[PDB]
DNA sequence: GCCCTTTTATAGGCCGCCATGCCGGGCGCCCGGCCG
DNA sequence: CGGCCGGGCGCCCGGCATGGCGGCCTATAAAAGGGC
DNA sequence: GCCCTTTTATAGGCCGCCATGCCGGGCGCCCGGCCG
DNA sequence: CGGCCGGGCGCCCGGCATGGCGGCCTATAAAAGGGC
């Protein structure tokens, strides 16, 4: 609750680096720029956070002050003409200084977030349920998003899984539903597991399976944390998960019962409509969660298989992609029922000449089914062999 | 070398060699305005070639706005005729062009800061006060205002060849900085 | 409304190429004369194949695909009609006339670019084939301007007016009578860009309105157009003349009796209803605003329902109506509706926060919906997604502060008609009146700064004056301007005018002087924080007991 | 200053002080290969820490592939033990690290051409032959290969502090060029 | 300082506005309980 | 188990009048001739 | 030259392939005509 | 006006064998120790 300390002794190296860069800016480039002595008082020799550091020790705030206010003042103090000679190196030094300040501030933010997350885990562990849970959930979700350390991320995942159960037993449900929605949101951030619809909205009748560096790591670590949280949540709740928490049900199901009986909003094809992304975000959760659900919820996924198969026959390419993935998973885990559905209501459609969507989805489902099941696909190769033999010589290239 | 400047303003001075009663000019000519508190001259205008004349009590006038030397001289002659028709014995004498302004647009942006740093002896740049780099050239005595958009305006010339020479002299420098 | 929304190098190339092609096409048409539609078919295919395609409700899904070339080919085809029609021979005027039924449907389409191109093309066609195109406009575009649910219909039908004025210029004089009422109505429309372009169109049209009474009739007007001009003349004649008609009522057998002042009030409401203008029925409490409101709402619903049997257009849809009241008055509203207007059906979205899902979809199925200010506020994120015919606020004064969240909530209600019931439209500051009219007629009194500078600052500065022209005149002119501006949209009627039995009310002030102890305490406090504590302390120490003792 | 290098290879030489019959090592150890035509040593390998040993007939060996000094020394000791088990009286003597290689990735691209032009005395750049700038440093004797991607690998060091000093020395230069 | 003409064009200060309050006073909502 | 419960607190009320962002608006810059 | 390890990474030459033909010989198409 | 017209020429046939782009593939670069 109380504001965090302005500094830590571990970041004295960062602050000292900032001090050295600022001193370079003040000294070397004004010697180059020919500004007389007395340009600025010397930076404090002792950096904040060190032992026996006085209250006037050098801090990041002094770095900001020198890189903005003293920079402007010194520029105004430079003689005309010499300013033109000196200014570009001053700009380079200023940008470098700002970069070091940003690095130090980011390190401080990371340490504060980690400490807050650990404290929140301690508070939830001893069964505290504050009447006003504003900061606790914020800290825990921050440690689910931006936690590079796997162990602490798993600990925060368990923390959320226990917090949801405690709130369900308490009866209050606002924050519970909010965090469940946020978990389902974070689970779908990774591009490789659920693509950005605004990019693929313009592609039709193409096999998706055949087709900035910093953000790639952030997306996958966030998705890792969310997936572990959801798995522990399901293991905790057991059979009753489909009864206790309905917000997950709405997220998973509302685009599935929508678009039924051939229904198709025109905005579903609109790149600027958020529902085109929300559809795939919804359909990712089935794959993300079904293998870890209880067998008591196998009837739920079985009853929803008629929706997934129709998504596999749908003319929307991403519908077929996600339906192939989800059918592969369902046939992996709910084996007999899913494979009955596949052999009885997918493989017959593989030979349709006019319905290119039918063949495309019904071959991509086989691709992903083999890839996920591996050795378990032995008893069903007799079903799968003839369609692939026929479609090796199909008209469509992919 | 490349493209050629386009002239935008020419200022000429001509002496009519006779005293003029300015308020009598103002009260008779529709195209004349007189405000002795603001300025000491009558501002006459004609629409072919589009030019303005600051006609003074001492007989001098300054004709501005012309896009060519022939147009400026013809406008000065027309203004002398107009003063003649109002009764004054004005005579066209002492014509001399005294300023030519030009403008050109080279097709690339300019790194003003590097140019100012390298050529600090002959340039001034205060971007807080004026976005254009000022450049003063010693040989043809032309002053160039350089802008990041790739547009240069030359001023202070008394002949067309002066702005042409100034543009030829400055073009390699602008090529060097993007 | 998309009309409101190295590159510099290519911009010149595009326009010079289009200039050359257009001149070539014009000379080609003049060469061929009447026979151009016979000798050259490929031009016909280019112009026409996306016009018969996508017609009769047709819509390929690839028409909305950014990577499908046909989405560009459609507009490329539709540009040629504008590019070429003014230079064609009169023998081809029948061709464009026969294709007008396709371009009008292109104007009604939900595709924005379709509406843009159709507005442009109809403007051109009405410029050149004037009588037939304007017959099509008045008969099959302007009737659709009032459709509540069909936003595309209104949007296209206002953009066509925009471009028609912009292209025809002075030639639009005989036809301003048809276009004046739609733009007047749509200046106060729920949608922002319709309001903006309607404002521009009205700025152009009102200057020409005084001339419309005597423009010579164009020679070729069809009988439908003469009848339209006559009926529009009779329609406008009541607006621009103090004379008025007997009020609008539906004489149902179970309908209640109306008093005289209630008769005048329903007359005023009907006058507002005809021309699509909004007001505040700011009567004193105890005069029965509920009867007048339900009377006009029921009469409008009855009229629309009856017209839906005489026609088949989507103008009427049996749309719902909304009423927002404080919780205590919902029972009174329902009792009055049931006893005075039985044939209406009522719904009460006043349930518990979970209960409301039991009637979430019932909002679109009942004639009158009743809700509370706070129930609407907490659930505005779902209530905004419904359209309404009438939107009544029973206690306006709740929404006087613009920053209050109830105002932000209520101002998102897209409604065809909009009315505030109140007793004190202005209580402390004219900005309260501005906040109310921002809900009723957005933009009518300008933005916040505009209204501030126009009225509010002079009104505040007039608080301390001694008949001095420095500030007295400013305040006087401000109140006069605000009075004239909002005159037709308020209807105040005093309780003294109506009630035949209410004794007079007398007022007297009782003056006294402060006691010695309190006086000394205040004199000490003068030497002695925040500004408000001083006022609160003065209020406290001000505490009269002898005055009350003697008065009782 | 900023980020720190990561060491990638360490090469150590240790003398076993006894002659070895290489073919007898090859015929008995599964993890040894001997090809006298190609190279004069047996290439032994062990899987903890992952290292390779070129063991020669003269008793010297070269142990490579380690990521740390302790790992290199422990691997050399294990190889000496393995030679002892095969019957030879090998004794761990004359250990000395003789090369350390490091790698780092500063987070911005580098303008190699300007760097080569300014620091021509200490660098070489032939982009037709090798896509990396070569930089030779005299004080710590470290050689740096600088790449446009922002990745620098240091080599020739005999201590960790040498590559640390070399990175500290070179980092301002890389900051100057983007 | 004052004015005329011309092509170029953008960022500091100056006058405003504008949300800040903070004590009682009330209403309405949902959020926790329990009662026969 | 159904139904009324108190219960908290967010929202709005209202005053004066101070301080911190504002957008917008010359002024900025260049040549030159003349007269005041 | 020869080899081991390690992180970095991309552009010249070398061996291929690959479309080039161009004289008669024929078929099929559409593109110009006219015939009773 | 309807129907068969000749009429041209683009397309494909086939041979051997030469010259000009190819992709791809080491080689390029750095340190160092050992022995041959």
Automatic annotation (TrEMBL), chain A:
Subcellular location as annotated: Nucleus
User: Its function?
Assistant: Regulates transcription in association with TATA binding protein (TBP). Removes TBP from the TATA box via its C-terminal ATPase activity. Both transcription activation and repression require its ATPase activity. Part of the NCT transcriptional regulatory complex that acts as a key regulator of ergosterol biosynthesis and the azole exporter cdr1B. The NCT complex binds the promoters of genes linked to azole susceptibility, and especially represses the expression of cdr1B transporter.
Subunit-structure text: Forms the NCT transcriptional regulatory complex with nctA and nctB.
Q: Which family does it belong to?
A: Belongs to the SNF2/RAD54 helicase family.
Protein name per the record: TATA-binding protein-associated factor mot1
Organism of origin:
Chaetomium thermophilum (strain DSM 1495 / CBS 144.50 / IMI 039719)
Automatic annotation (TrEMBL), chains B, D:
Instruction: List the taxonomic lineage.
Output: Eukaryota, Fungi, Dikarya, Ascomycota, Pezizomycotina
The record's Gene Ontology cellular component field reads: nucleus; transcription regulator complex
Compartment(s) where it occurs, according to its Swiss-Prot or TrEMBL record: Nucleus
Q: Mainly localized where? A: nucleus
Q: Which residues of the full protein are shown?
A: 76 to 253 of 255
Q: What is this protein called?
A: Putative tata-box binding protein
GO MF, one example: DNA binding
- What is the organism of origin for this protein? Chaetomium thermophilum (strain DSM 1495 / CBS 144.50 / IMI 039719)
Give one GO biological process term. Answer: transcription initiation at RNA polymerase II promoter
Q: Keywords for this entry?
A: DNA-binding, Nucleus, Transcription
Family assignment?
A: Belongs to the TBP family.
Q: Hey, what's the signal peptide range on this chain?
A: none
């Amino acid at each position: 609750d109380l504001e965090r300390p302005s500094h830590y002794r571990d970041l004295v190296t960062y602050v000292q680096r900032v001090r050295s860069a600022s001193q370079q800016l003040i000294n070397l480039f004004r010697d180059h720029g020919k500004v007389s002595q007395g340009k600025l008082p010397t930076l404090a020799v002792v950096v904040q956070g060190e032992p026996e550091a006085g209250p006037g020790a050098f801090s990041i705030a002094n770095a900001e002050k020198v890189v903005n206010e003293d920079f402007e003042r010194l520029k105004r103090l430079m003689a005309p003409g010499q300013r033109l000679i000196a200014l570009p190196q001053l700009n380079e030094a200023r940008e470098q200084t700002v970069e070091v300040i940003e690095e130090a501030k980011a390190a401080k933010e990371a340490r504060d977030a980690r400490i807050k997350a650990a404290a929140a885990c301690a508070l939830v562990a001893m069964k505290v349920l504050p009447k006003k849970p504003s900061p606790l959930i914020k800290a825990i979700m921050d440690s689910i998003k931006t936690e590079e350390n796997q162990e602490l991320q798993s600990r925060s995942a368990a923390t959320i899984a226990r917090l949801v159960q405690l709130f369900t037993e308490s009866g209050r449900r606002g924050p519970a539903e909010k965090v469940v929605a946020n978990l389902v949101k974070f689970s779908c951030v990774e591009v490789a597991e659920t693509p950005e619809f605004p990019i693929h909205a313009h592609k039709t009748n193409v096999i998706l399976s055949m087709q900035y560096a910093r953000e790639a790591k952030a997306a996958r670590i966030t998705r890792r944390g969310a997936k572990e949280a959801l798995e522990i949540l399901s293991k905790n709740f057991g059979a009753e998960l489909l009864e206790r928490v309905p917000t997950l049900r709405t997220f998973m199901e509302e685009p599935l019962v929508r678009a039924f009986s051939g229904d198709l909003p025109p905005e579903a094809r609109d790149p600027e409509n958020a529902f085109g992304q929300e559809i795939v975000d919804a359909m990712s959760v089935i794959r993300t969660m079904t293998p870890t659900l209880h067998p008591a919820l196998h009837p739920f996924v079985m009853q929803q298989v008629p929706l997934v198969i129709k998504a596999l026959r749908s003319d929307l390419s991403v519908f077929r992609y996600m339906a192939a993935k989800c059918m592969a998973t369902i046939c992996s885990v709910i084996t007999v029922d899913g494979m009955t559905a596949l052999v009885e209501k997918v493989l017959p459609s593989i030979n349709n000449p006019l319905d290119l969507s039918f063949r495309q989805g019904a071959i991509e489902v086989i691709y992903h089914l083999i890839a996920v099941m591996g050795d378990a696909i032995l008893p069903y190769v007799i079903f799968l062999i003839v369609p692939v033999l026929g479609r090796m010589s199909d008209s469509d290239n992919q | 070398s490349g493209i050629t400047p386009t002239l935008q303003n020419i200022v000429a001075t001509v002496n009519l060699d006779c005293r003029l009663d300015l308020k009598t000019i103002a009260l008779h000519a529709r195209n004349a305005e007189y405000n002795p508190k603001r300025f000491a001259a009558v501002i006459m205008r004609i629409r072919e070639p589009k030019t303005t004349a600051l006609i003074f009590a001492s007989g001098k006038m300054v004709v501005t706005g012309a896009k060519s030397e022939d147009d400026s001289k013809l406008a000065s002659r027309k203004y002398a005729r107009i003063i003649q028709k109002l009764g004054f014995n004005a005579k066209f004498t002492d014509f001399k062009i005294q300023n030519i302004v030009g403008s050109c647009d080279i097709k690339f942006p300019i790194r003003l800061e590097g140019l100012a740093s390298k050529h600090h002896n002959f340039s001034s740049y205060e971007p807080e006060l004026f976005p254009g780099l000022i450049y003063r050239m010693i040989k043809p005595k032309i002053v160039l205002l350089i802008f990041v958009s790739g547009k240069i305006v030359l001023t202070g010339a008394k002949v067309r060849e002066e702005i042409y020479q100034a543009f030829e002299m400055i073009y390699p420098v602008l090529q060097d900085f993007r | 409304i998309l009309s409101m929304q190295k590159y510099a190098r290519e911009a010149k190339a595009a326009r010079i190429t289009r200039r050359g092609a257009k001149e070539a096409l014009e000379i080609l048409s003049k060469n061929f004369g009447a026979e151009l539609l016979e000798r050259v078919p490929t031009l016909r295919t280019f112009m026409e194949e996306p016009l018969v395609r996508a017609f009769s409700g047709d819509l390929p899904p690839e028409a909305r695909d950014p990577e499908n070339a046909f989405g560009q080919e459609i507009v490329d085809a539709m540009s040629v009609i504008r590019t070429m029609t003014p230079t064609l021979h009169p023998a081809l005027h029948p061709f464009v006339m026969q294709q007008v039924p396709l371009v009008i449907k292109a104007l009604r389409s939900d595709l924005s670019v379709f509406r843009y191109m159709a507005a442009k093309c109809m403007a051109t066609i009405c410029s050149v084939i004037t009588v037939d195109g304007m017959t099509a406009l008045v008969e099959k575009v302007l009737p659709s301007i009032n459709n509540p649910l069909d936003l595309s219909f209104r949007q296209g039908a206002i953009e066509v007016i925009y471009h028609l004025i912009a292209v025809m210029g002075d030639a639009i004089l005989p036809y301003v009578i048809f276009l004046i009422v739609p733009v007047l109505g749509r200046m106060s429309d729920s949608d922002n860009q319709i309001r903006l372009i309607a404002t521009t169109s009205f700025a152009t049209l009102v200057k020409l309105v005084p001339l419309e009474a005597g423009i010579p009739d164009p020679p070729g007007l069809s009988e439908e157009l003469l009848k339209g001009r006559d009926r529009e003349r009779t329609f406008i004649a009541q607006l621009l003349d103090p004379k008025k008609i007997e009020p609008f009522k539906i004489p149902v057998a179970i309908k209640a009796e109306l008093r005289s002042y209630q008769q005048e009030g329903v007359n005023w409401l009907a006058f507002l209803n005809k021309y699509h203008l909004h007001g505040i029925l700011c009567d004193d409490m105890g005069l029965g605003k509920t009867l007048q409101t339900i009377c006009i709402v029921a009469s409008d619903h009855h009229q629309r329902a009856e017209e839906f049997a005489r026609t088949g257009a989507p103008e009427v849809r049996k749309l719902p109506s909304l009423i927002i009241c404080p919780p205590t008055l919902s029972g009174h509203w329902q009792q009055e509706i049931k006893t005075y207007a039985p044939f209406l059906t009522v719904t009460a979205y006043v349930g518990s926060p979970a209960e409301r899902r039991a009637m979430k979809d019932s909002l679109d199925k009942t004639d009158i919906v009743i809700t509370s200010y706070d129930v609407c506020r907490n659930d505005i994120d779902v209530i905004e997604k419904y359209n309404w015919n009438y939107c009544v606020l029973d206690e306006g004064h709740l929404i006087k502060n613009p920053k209050a969240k109830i105002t932000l909530a209520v101002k998102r209600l897209t409604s065809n008609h909009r009315l505030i019931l109140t007793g004190t439209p202005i209580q402390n500051n004219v900005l309260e009146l501005w906040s109310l009219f921002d809900f009723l007629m957005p933009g009518f009194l300008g933005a916040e700064k505009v209204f501030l500078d126009r009225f509010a600052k002079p009104i505040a500065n007039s608080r301390y004056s001694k008949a001095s022209s420095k500030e007295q005149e400013a305040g006087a002119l401000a109140i006069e301007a605000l009075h004239k501006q909002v005159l037709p949209f308020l209807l105040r009627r005093l309780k003294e005018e109506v009630l035949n039995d209410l004794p007079p009310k007398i007022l007297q002030n009782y003056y006294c002087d402060l006691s010695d102890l309190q006086r000394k305490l205040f004199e000490d406090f003068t030497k002695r924080q925040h500004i408000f504590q001083a006022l609160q302390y003065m209020r406290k120490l001000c505490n009269k007991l002898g005055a009350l003792r003697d008065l009782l």
